[PDB]
Structure formats: structure tokens, C-alpha cells
Amino acid sequence: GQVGRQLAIIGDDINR
């Protein structure tokens, strides 16, 4: 996948 999107998804998880 696109790394940015992937990173955002991880980031949104870490944000929790």
C-alpha cells in the first residue's frame, strides 16, 4: 500500500 496512508493508519492507532 501507499506508505503515507499506512503510516496515517498506524498513527491513528498510536493516537488512541
Next chain:
Amino acid sequence: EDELYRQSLEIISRYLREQATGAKDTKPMGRSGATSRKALETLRRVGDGVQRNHETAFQGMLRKLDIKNEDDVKSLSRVMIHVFSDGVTNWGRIVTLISFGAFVAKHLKTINQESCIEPLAESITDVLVRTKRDWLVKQRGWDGFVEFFHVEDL
């Protein structure tokens, strides 16, 4: 000049350098060094966990980006821009970028690209401070980072 840049760079560089070299930099911090120490401490706790919990994806993203020289670090600034392209900014995304930075910086050292860690830390700082300054300032900068990830007591 920009203190936020300076402080962000200090924190991100230290984490990246420290993660890549395995050596904690004993040199005191610059200004907002209390904040930066705690930011770095926070970065270690949260960042290290991000790399552990998302190591497979980080490896995949690293293999995909194929970061092997200073130029490739630009490709990472692009990706970090892409992170924020949906308009959402939060500390989880920010720390994840820094965490991935540390992950990349580790890999960078295994390939005599230690020279690229400073550009790496720079590009991460630049993306954050250049494009998310308003959000950063609104979140009280690295104090907001420390507070956001502060582990509360009962």
C-alpha cells in the same frame, strides 16, 4: 532561528541518532530542555513501542521506500506529507512518523548511511514544523506531545 524547529530537531535527531547508534546522547538539551528531555523520554517509550508493534509494516514500508541514501530521505518527506494529506493531524501520526524515522535511521546505520540520519531527522522535523506548525503551536508543541502520551496515575 525557529525555536520550534530547533527543539523538534533536537528531539527527533536525538531519538533517531540514539535509536540508530544505541547511544543515549548525554549532552544536555538546548532550550525547553525539560520539555525536550520528557519529549525524548516519551518518544522512547511510545516510539519504541510503535516500532515493536508495527515492525512488520515498518519493514514493509522501509523495503518499499528503499531508503538507501540522502536523496531517498526526500522520498520520506513525500510520504510524511502524504500522511497528513487527509487533513488529520494528531500526536499518534506524529510520533509514528518519528518512530518510523528511528526505524529508518537504524537501517540507515546498517548501510554506512549514518550521514543520512541527520537529513532524515531534518526532513521529519521540516515536515512537522514547516507544514504542521499551527497545529503544533495549538497543541503547545512538545509539551502537548508529552501530555498527550503521559501515562496517568490512578
